[PDB]
Design a protein around this nucleic acid. Sequence first.
DNA 1: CTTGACAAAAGTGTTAAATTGTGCTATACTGGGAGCCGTCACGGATGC
DNA 2: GCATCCGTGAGTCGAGGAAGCACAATTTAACACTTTTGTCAAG
Lengths: 338, 1362, 96, 48
Amino acid sequence: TSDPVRQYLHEIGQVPLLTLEEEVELARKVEEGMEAIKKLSEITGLDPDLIREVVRAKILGSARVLDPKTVEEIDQKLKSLPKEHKRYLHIAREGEAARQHLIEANLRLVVSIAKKYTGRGLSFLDLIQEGNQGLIRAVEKFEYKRRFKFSTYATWWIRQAINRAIADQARTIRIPVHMVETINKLSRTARQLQQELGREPTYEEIAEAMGPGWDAKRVEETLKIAQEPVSLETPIGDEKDSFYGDFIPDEHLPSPVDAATQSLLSEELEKALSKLSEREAMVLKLRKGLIDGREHTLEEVGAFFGVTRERIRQIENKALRKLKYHESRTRKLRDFLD
Amino acid sequence: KEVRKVRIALASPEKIRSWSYGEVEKPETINYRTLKPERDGLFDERIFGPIKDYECACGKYKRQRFEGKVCERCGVEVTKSIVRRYRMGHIELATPAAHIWFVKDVPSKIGTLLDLSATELEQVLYFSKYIVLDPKGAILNGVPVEKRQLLTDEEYRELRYGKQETYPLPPGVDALVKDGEEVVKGQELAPGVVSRLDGVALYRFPRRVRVEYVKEPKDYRVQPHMNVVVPEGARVEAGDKIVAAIDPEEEVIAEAEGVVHLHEPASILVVKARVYPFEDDVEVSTGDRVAPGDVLADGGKVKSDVYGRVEVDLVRNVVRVVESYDIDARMGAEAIQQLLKELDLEALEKELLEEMKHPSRARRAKARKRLEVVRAFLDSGNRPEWMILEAVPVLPPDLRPMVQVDGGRFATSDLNDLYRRLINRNNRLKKLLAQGAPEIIIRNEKRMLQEAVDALLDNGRRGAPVTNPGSDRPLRSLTDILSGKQGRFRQNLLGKRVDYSGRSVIVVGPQLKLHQCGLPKRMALELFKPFLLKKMEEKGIAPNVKAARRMLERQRDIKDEVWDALEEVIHGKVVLLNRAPTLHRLGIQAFQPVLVEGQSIQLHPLVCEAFNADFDGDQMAVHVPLSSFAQAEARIQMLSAHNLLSPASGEPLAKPSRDIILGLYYITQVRKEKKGAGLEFATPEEALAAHERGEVALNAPIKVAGRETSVGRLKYVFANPDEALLAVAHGIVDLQDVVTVRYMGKRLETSPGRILFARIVAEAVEDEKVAWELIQLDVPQEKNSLKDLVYQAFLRLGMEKTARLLDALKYYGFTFSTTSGITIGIDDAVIPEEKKQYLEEADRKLLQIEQAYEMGFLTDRERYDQILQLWTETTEKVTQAVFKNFEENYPFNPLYVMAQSGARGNPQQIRQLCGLRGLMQKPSGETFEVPVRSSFREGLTVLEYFISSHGARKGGADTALRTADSGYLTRKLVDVTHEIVVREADCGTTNYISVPLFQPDEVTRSLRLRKRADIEAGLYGRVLAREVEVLGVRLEEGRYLSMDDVHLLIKAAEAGEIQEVPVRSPLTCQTRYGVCQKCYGYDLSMARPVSIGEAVGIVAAQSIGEPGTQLTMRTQGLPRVIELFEARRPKAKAVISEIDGVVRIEETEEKLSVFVESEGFSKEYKLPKEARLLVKDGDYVEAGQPLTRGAIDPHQLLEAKGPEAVERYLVEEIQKVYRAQGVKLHDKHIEIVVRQMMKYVEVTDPGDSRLLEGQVLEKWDVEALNERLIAEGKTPVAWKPLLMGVTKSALSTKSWLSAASFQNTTHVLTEAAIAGKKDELIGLKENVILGRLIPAGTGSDFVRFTQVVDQKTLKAIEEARK
Amino acid sequence: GKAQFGGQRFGEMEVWALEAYGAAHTLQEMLTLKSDDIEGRNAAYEAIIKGEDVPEPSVPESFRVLVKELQALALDVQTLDEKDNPVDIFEGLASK
Amino acid sequence: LSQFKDETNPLSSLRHKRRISALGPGGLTRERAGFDVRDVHRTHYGRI
DNA sequence: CTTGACAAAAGTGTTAAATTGTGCTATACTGGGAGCCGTCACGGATGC
DNA sequence: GCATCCGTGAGTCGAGGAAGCACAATTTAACACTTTTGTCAAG
Ligand SMILES: [Mg+2]
Ligand SMILES: [Mg+2]
Ligand SMILES: [Zn+2]
Ligand SMILES: [Zn+2]
């Protein structure tokens, strides 16, 4: 009870292993059910996905949460078909039941596959569930006509699903599957060179061994990308009273000094603009975003004041020159420039 | 508006979705390359807001002009980035998940509502056993299935899918049962295997088919890849297919007409089912569920006869109905949610009220608990189904940041990992459900989802804690964030790091005043940086603030006028000096900074004892109050010179110390000579002439005619102190010689040192008569005399003159200790001549004891006890010899002077230095037979040093493990009495307590006067409830008892006129949420009646907890105090008489019994054989009076005698431990804490009220309810007093914030959320958490609204108004 | 820490000492103005460098973090006024 | 148990190399230790 | 205040290269690995 | 009434920072071309 893995193993131990004959009959029933669903969709004209969902819902019973009324209506429509079509309906139902039984009876295989993938960033049960998804896909794509046992074909899909899940879910910052494969290949090459040379290889040897198109810079960038983020709650010291977050300053919000100097700059600029004329000050505020908006272009301000662009530029330049003269004669605004 | 109350309640899924700005559908946090957050992720800008202010993700809007606008290209609202700290998300779970706080927090609230045990709830929630919500006519083992019944996996499968079994036949053998036949249990199917259940038996895989041609029993073999497509006993015409195969070449057909027979099955399937043959089309299909009377086939001709799963077999073309029931049984949090939804709280409350009348006590208790939960849910308005989460809230990303350090590495919190795991599991469950995964996989994924939710809410509570792969460090969940010593409450809410704060090593400053400290120039510049920038801007040092800051950035760019500006700034301002631990309230003191050249803080010596700070490397912190309120509070209330008396006891705390006491004692001690020492004369001239002859010494006590004087008192008569000190300066006489002086018109016979001390006091207080009345000139000035002088000066003059006197005493004591010549040498530890004789006597007695033991006159245990007693007696005799030698031969010996004056050392340490080290203890606790006969001066041996190391290490470990316990007890006391404040001048109560002046000593078995210290601690600064007439003095009601009044009462008791003093105490105070001014009494820190608004609860807690470290730990010491405050039942508890009566002892060899006999009642107590009975036959014992020596159980005493008796016992026992250690502590603090302990009662008779029998509530609330019921004529509620420890009392407070921040955060929070408790912010902790103005001190409503106005403006207002 | 140029820890015991003195305003400053009241501390610094008195402090950011984490634990923490009406301490930034 | 070396003076490093710690992986803990482990046993003579 | 010529700055519309995400491997594999340990005391239910 | 599992707690500062492979769907650097100014001559 306390160990989820123990409970899951106990649950999967209640389904007996499938013999070869049972495996063959279940695979044949699944194939016949899929073919019957295809024929029913071809005849009645309904969506194959919709028919498959209705059949699956009926097989799974009412213990599952599209509204059930349309499922019942579609089931009644299918049952209203003549005997030659109710035959295919029954074949589809048996195929769905056989698919459920076949999926239920291969959980030991996926557990055995996933027990070898532990410790790669995902927990054991997550690997088991992703392998279950891969097993469902394998059951969907399995073909019994080739006379190969189900384990051989299912292993490929189970390990593919497990590896894809590890690539997509074992890192806090997600990395695409192709980049994950690149990082894994780089790590393997680095390890091989490290064991061959008896020392840690430099980036040049790793890049040379990787192949064409690889240099030291690309290897360094790939290694930098492959850096897992560090936890903010890692203790430092014998006592458990310190964390990384206690040593990382917040550089987003403005400091009190920054806010104070911004307010001082705003006040000084407002006082300096008082020397300007009423129109010139307004033009400069519009052109520099002092009205909290994006800096209005010359044409926008001119249309606001009903003036042409050139005159707006000229008056803005004249007001700027006057402000420069006042600053030169006062020197009460230079310190804020930094 | 202003925040006045805080409400906590359950969050409905609709409310949770309302909070969220969007659903987080992906676990992606940020992009690895562009570093921008991913869409729909944990850090999405579209949900939680933009990273930077006024900038959308698409980069189209980048200004405040589009404020409050949502970009159409990207969806990110254009607003301030700070909303990223306040905007939450939500995760829509595929299936409901139960909140762990309401599952694993015993008692389980969900289990309490559903009447399900913890194990059953865990099994149902975590998919171990099914629970039935609708039986649907299901019968199990002959018993119909009832609702709310737990079904295991096997039972559920049996009820839902029927009974089926498969028996694998060995290869080659043929089954004895044909395909489609009913068999019974135990019937043989094959010769080697038998069935185990009755049902229809079906062939699984026929390996051989036997067709019978009619014209020929031709047989065909069936392989695993070949399947038979015809039933047994079926007529097959020529050409019809028989067996289908993958390859048509090997397909089996029929040559001619025949009958197909199946043989050699691989296995037999026995299923409990009904088989119906049919001919026409069937009306049902495989997988459906049918009921009796339903149509199956042939258009109604074939009808079902039993419930079960229907399946059509086209090969055998029959309909098989497996006997099963469509039972509605579910697991996980969905079933629990459905059950909680179906509950009707009103009907459940009515049923619980009906059950509450059952005589059974356990039934009543269970019904009371369940009814309390139901009433909490009803009154709060919450819904039970809200306890299961449907949408998981998501914390704002800035509270779980993924930041990039300056080194380029990414640092993220564990909450991001927990959210990622939860989202991954939820998406996987959604995909599995969409793909039609089987029941096992779906159940496992749902269990994983529930466990992920539990780990996110509280990691490690259930199952193995979730750890980051690659390490074993558990992830920090929300509960771990908000709970523990490192949690939010104790690390960022109750205590914070502050700006304008520095820290440096302290050094002693003797030249400083009592209200001054030496602040280093660099520290002052950095702490007062904004004020310094403003001052520099005011003058010509810098043009503006930015230029001044740039100037101050570089050390070499600072001019010389910056220091002058800094000195101008700090004028008048004060800074708070702090030293950790702040054991009592004087650990932070306001001082006026003085700029000094250096890097170390100069600390006044007198406050050192207040700070508990020496100069062996201590560090102190400096804090700078900013506004006018803070400066006024620091300068008026927090000033060092204003806190001269200890609030714990009322005695001075800033008093003369080691060097000051040493110097004052040295100058004020007189010389005793032995040259004459008895010679008698006839005339003074004869004594003088003998003095010049050298026969008699100057200070030798002689008799002139009849009186006993000395030569100094006759030879040197000084007309005034000036002449005496002038003669001292010339070396004619010493400060320690006894001469005659004419002071204040009186011819005193004293030393020039004592006259100089009198002049020092007179000049310090600037009043000769008062100074003369304050001091005692006939004794040397030890620590106690100086403390009494300081207290009397405080009483007679005030704080300012007392501070001036303290400064003068400090200066003169330092100067005289410097010039006197105190030094420690190896010969200063004088070895007495009696030590060798005592050791020889001890050796002879030990030899005699050993000889007697060899003779067999005594055993090992009593011989060891006798040896211990002998060595203890020898050690005591050696100590007495050492001190007698010092007081006879070397009265000015530095060790003796330091011990007597109280400057340093105690008689035990002086003995160890001069006498013998003594007995030492083994690590197990036993004492060694041989003592350490060698002192430190003579030098110990290797073996003796090793023996003493055991005791030294034991003491060190005791101190180490005792400091933490003392601090934790102090925290408990603070958290239980944080709400106690003086809230009114007088509550008008008429109750009081009679403080006894006599103790019933048992060795004499009579009343004896208590010690003066105890009476002072129990009566000083208290208001008399009733007028007392003693010694012709009438102390009227309402008069505060000063020290003079306490001494008068003590003298009256010594005269046998008064036995007990009736005083008003906090125990009898009727003030709600605090005390009153007339009940508390004096503010012991000021020796005046307590000011309204003082936080006396915190003062009391700190005063009680400060000397906890000094208490010896080794039912004795600090553990005794802890068990007294927690109201714990002692292991060696005493036996008390429940009822009063005559005692009768029935001591017998078989059993020991004590009988209490009354007029009609007789009680029996079976005492242990080894019980130290303290009562003999023929005694009248009262209720609750002890019968055996030991510790009284407080609960038994409360239930036997009453609340007053148990309160008195608790106060007395707590104070006894402090008395035993010499610590003086006023009883007001202990009484306040006990009153907080006795604040709760338990209802016994509900009466005409909605309260439940056995419910525990507050005494004030039940009293208010009783008076309200009486007002309109209703039956009052009967309540019984209840005593609980400080922990339980603090945890059950009405305000959930303080309880959550104290201890058991999860339990307090879940109870508050269920009950919807609203915090009224009454105490001090809640206001601290919210950062508001605390309702104490200057923040009290009594004084907060005071208005100050001048004359001119007030006159203008009156003239303009009237 | 000195290396990180940090402030001095004003733990629980110092708060208890301030409460015992009754210095309500000093304690409020040390809890809000000097520790975590972002707007409060910025305004106080601006007032001090301008020669004015610091303004009245506001709700600390630590209490906001408390409220947000309690909400994340699916607990509805609401601050009310004298008339029991809800009071928004986030200035409408967290309101949809 | 792998501690940052204290080499203020040669005596500092010399003592640090000769230190015996009851804590560490698989050992006692600072607040899980009673008086029994912290006392000087009679057998510490000449060894600790 | 206006009326035309220029010369970049930014936005629009393809273009493929780079990057990203999903599908697929057919002898046969069918229930996990790490712990693991020196503390005492006090609620408080959980049963006998 | 009693043995037993479970949960919670146990001082303050400071100074300690293990596949690839093919192929299709999505993004974007690089240009090419109108569009929009910023500025300059002309008074
Ligand atoms: Mg010290
Ligand atoms: Mg004379
Ligand atoms: Zn946008
Ligand atoms: Zn009162």
